[PDB]
Amino acid sequence: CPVSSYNEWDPLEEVIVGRAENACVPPFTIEVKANTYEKYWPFYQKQGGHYFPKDHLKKAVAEIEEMCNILKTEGVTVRRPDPIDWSLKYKTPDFESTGLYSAMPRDILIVVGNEIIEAPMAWRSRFFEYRAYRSIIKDYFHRGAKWTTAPKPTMADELYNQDYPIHSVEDRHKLAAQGKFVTTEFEPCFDAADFIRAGRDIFAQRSQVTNYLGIEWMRRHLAPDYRVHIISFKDPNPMHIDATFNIIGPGIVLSNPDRPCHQIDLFKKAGWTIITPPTPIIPDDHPLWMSSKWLSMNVLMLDEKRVMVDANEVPIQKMFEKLGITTIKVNIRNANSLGGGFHCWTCDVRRRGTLQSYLD
Amino acid sequence: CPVSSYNEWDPLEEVIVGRAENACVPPFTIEVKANTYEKYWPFYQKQGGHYFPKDHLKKAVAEIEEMCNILKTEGVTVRRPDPIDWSLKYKTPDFESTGLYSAMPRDILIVVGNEIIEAPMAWRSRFFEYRAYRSIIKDYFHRGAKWTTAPKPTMADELYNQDYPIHSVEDRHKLAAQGKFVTTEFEPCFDAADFIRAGRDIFAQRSQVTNYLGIEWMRRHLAPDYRVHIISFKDPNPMHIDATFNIIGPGIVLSNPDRPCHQIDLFKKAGWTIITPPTPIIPDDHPLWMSSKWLSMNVLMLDEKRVMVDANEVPIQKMFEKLGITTIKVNIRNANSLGGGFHCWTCDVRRRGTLQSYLD
Numbered sequence: 001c002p003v004s005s006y007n008e009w010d011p012l013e014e015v016i017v018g019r020a021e022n023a024c025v026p027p028f029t030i031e032v033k034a035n036t037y038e039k040y041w042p043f044y045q046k047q048g049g050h051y052f053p054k055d056h057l058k059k060a061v062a063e064i065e066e067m068c069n070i071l072k073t074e075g076v077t078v079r080r081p082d083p084i085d086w087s088l089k090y091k092t093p094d095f096e097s098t099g100l101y102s103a104m105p106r107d108i109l110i111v112v113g114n115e116i117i118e119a120p121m122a123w124r125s126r127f128f129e130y131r132a133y134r135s136i137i138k139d140y141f142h143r144g145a146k147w148t149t150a151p152k153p154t155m156a157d158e159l160y161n162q163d164y165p166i167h168s169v170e171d172r173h174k175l176a177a178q179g180k181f182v183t184t185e186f187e188p189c190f191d192a193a194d195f196i197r198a199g200r201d202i203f204a205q206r207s208q209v210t211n212y213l214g215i216e217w218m219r220r221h222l223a224p225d226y227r228v229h230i231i232s233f234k235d236p237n238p239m240h241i242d243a244t245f246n247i248i249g250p251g252i253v254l255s256n257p258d259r260p261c262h263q264i265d266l267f268k269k270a271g272w273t274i275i276t277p278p279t280p281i282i283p284d285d286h287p288l289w290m291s292s293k294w295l296s297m298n299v300l301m302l303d304e305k306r307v308m309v310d311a312n313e314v315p316i317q318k319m320f321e322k323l324g325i326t327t328i329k330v331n332i333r334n335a336n337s338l339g340g341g342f343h344c345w346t347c348d349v350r351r352r353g354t355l356q357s358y359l360d
Numbered sequence: 361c362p363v364s365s366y367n368e369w370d371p372l373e374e375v376i377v378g379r380a381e382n383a384c385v386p387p388f389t390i391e392v393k394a395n396t397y398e399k400y401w402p403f404y405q406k407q408g409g410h411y412f413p414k415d416h417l418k419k420a421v422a423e424i425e426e427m428c429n430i431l432k433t434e435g436v437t438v439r440r441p442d443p444i445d446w447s448l449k450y451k452t453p454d455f456e457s458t459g460l461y462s463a464m465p466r467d468i469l470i471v472v473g474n475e476i477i478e479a480p481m482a483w484r485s486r487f488f489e490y491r492a493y494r495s496i497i498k499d500y501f502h503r504g505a506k507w508t509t510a511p512k513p514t515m516a517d518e519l520y521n522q523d524y525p526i527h528s529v530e531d532r533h534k535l536a537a538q539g540k541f542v543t544t545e546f547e548p549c550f551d552a553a554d555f556i557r558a559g560r561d562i563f564a565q566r567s568q569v570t571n572y573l574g575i576e577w578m579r580r581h582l583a584p585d586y587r588v589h590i591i592s593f594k595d596p597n598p599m600h601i602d603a604t605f606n607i608i609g610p611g612i613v614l615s616n617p618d619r620p621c622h623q624i625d626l627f628k629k630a631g632w633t634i635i636t637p638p639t640p641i642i643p644d645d646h647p648l649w650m651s652s653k654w655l656s657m658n659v660l661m662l663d664e665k666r667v668m669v670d671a672n673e674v675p676i677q678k679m680f681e682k683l684g685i686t687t688i689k690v691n692i693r694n695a696n697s698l699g700g701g702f703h704c705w706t707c708d709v710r711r712r713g714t715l716q717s718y719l720d
């Protein structure tokens with residue numbers, strides 16, 4: 001089987017790397033507002049439906065091409081999604097919208113064993129995102145892999161709290177703490193990036209884009225071989241878990257110092273080593289349209305002792321080095337602006353290894 | 361100025377479209393043999409000096425007339441070369457020969473800014489090809505355009521390796537790789553179709569008909585405003601670059617999957633999107649006297665989002681459509697036999713736009 005990955009660290013053999021091409025600024029709708037920083041709301045308000053700045057995109061393309069070159073150098077087979085113009089307006093019986101991009105494979109695809117799963121998504125501008133990945137997936141299917149598409153939401157108004165009282169990131173954090181998110185429990189929805197793998201145990205967080213119905217779907221679909229656990233954090237990122245709690249080896253995890261896990265003791269009890277990375281050094285003037293500055297810890301492990309890390313983030317490079325982990329430095333400063341780091345920009349399709357339990 | 365074109369994609373306003381009339385099969389000399397497939401060598405050997413099959417030419421005329429109709433429909437002003445009998449034998453102090461045709465304006469004329477340049481050519485049967493275009497060029501000159509004629513070669517025996525060891529297309533590919541071509545460096549020579557424009561940067565390839573002296577001439581003549589770069593490919597077409605590396609927009613290029621560019625990383629580093637088109641579907645029984653089957657990617661851009669493409673080549677039509685580029689389908693299956701696709705059969709005289717750099 002070409003597809004086979006049970007965790008985030010076994011020796012990487014094949015990966016899908018995203019594309020920056022024709023990326024479109026999403027229309028400024030409620031769910032977009034609930035997942036971005038106030039600083040950019042007016043950018044979305046004005047640029048909505050237009051391409052992201054083309055000079056910026058060009059730099060991102062260059063950065064990602066180099067990353068792919070380095071992966072091939074590290075012995076990894078790289079697959080890329082198909083080029084597509086994301087500006088096309090589409091219309092379902094429930095809504096109308098333009099697209100986003102196919103920059104982040106981690107947001108939509110998750111590999112559990114020999115099974116590739118397409119996440120439903122929760123943003124209207126990402127409804128047809130799966131189209132960029134179908135050529136690769138059909139190939140794996142022909143070659144023997146299992147293929148699953150979680151139930152695609154209608155994304156009708158009922159899935160969103162149109163009056164979600166968010167006016168600042170501080171409000172959202174408060175609401176989030178009260179169990180209030182922009183997405184209701186009308187129908188299942190989720191981004192695959194809210195799930196992180198550790199063999200037989202998979203950890204998920206209810207976020208602005210992933211609801212309890214969505215997590216339950218994953219839970220019910222993967223049982224009994226896999227167990228899906230729900231964990232929560234203080235002042236969580238509106239979406240995605242990989243820059244909050246990135247598992248980098250058997251029993252080792254990177255815990256974002258600003259977003260402590262409410263269930264950290266479950267991990268301490270299992271004898272897991274919780275590492276808190278140093279703060280990011282990325283300039284506050286650099287645009288991060290989506291995401292926080294914590295992309296620095298959004299690393300991708302080529303294996304247990306080899307990590308692809310940002311060339312600019314020296315302080316976290318040193319941390320890995322004192323731990324005896326070889327750092328493969330790559331610069332994706334401009335690609336970062338699109339919303340992701342190495343883990344987000346990829347989807348590990350095949351890692352050499354077996355299914356195990358690390359929670360014991 | 362009626363003449364003004366800095367690249368291959370700005371909004372087209374005026375174009376010169378070739379003619380199939382009185383096309384003559386070139387005498388089978390060494391340079392003709394080095395630029396054609398073994399399958400047709402005996403055709404040239406027998407038909408040399410006679411007109412190409414007249415029933416075939418008639419079909420080509422019909423196809424090109426329709427193309428012109430569609431261009432006028434798309435708002436483009438079309439100029440056509442003068443009708444001429446190419447069978448006339450001429451004689452310079454260096455050689456004697458019959459002509460070819462004025463089917464491919466791209467082979468002989470290149471527009472750089474407000475300047476129209478007549479290529480010297482490298483085939484003895486194309487020595488007097490410029491005669492079909494003089495009425496149009498003098499008109500543009502009277503109207504203000506700059507007019508240049510690169511040094512016309514003597515085309516004496518010294519320009520050719522009379523004993524060029526080509527017996528199959530596989531031999532040529534090997535020789536080409538060794539830096540051995542049918543044309544020596546005796547005097548400058550080139551076809552304008554070996555040059556492709558991207559604003560301040562122009563790319564050229566040393567081919568069977570374009571030597572280093574010829575490229576240097578262009579380089580020296582256009583400096584300092586324009587930079588002429590030499591790029592090479594694996595298993596290149598004996599002549600012309602436009603069905604190997606066709607630039608279709610700012611930072612976007614079509615790279616023939618069978619002829620990868622040795623310098624592709626220069627482009628990846630600039631943040632250019634390299635698209636590899638699907639394979640041609642043209643029947644192997646259809647005669648392609650000159651050219652390979654890759655005419656499918658020899659498209660002409662009416663603007664960045666409008667491309668004139670072959671009606672029969674559905675797979676490449678789909679590629680453009682997923683990229684959000686409107687396809688203007690036209691059938692030139694029979695015209696193709698003469699050696700070209702849309703880019704070859706035309707010469708963009710005026711595109712609306714300015715001189716820019718896209719390599720940064």
Ligand SMILES: [NH3+]CCCCC(=O)O
Binds near residue numbers: 104241290291292
């Ligand atoms: N998938 C990438 C988004 C990560 C955003 C953050 O945690 O700041």
Ligand SMILES: [NH3+]CCCCC(=O)O
Binds near residue numbers: 464652
């Ligand atoms: N000027 C048209 C010749 C193109 C031939 C080829 O590249 O197969």
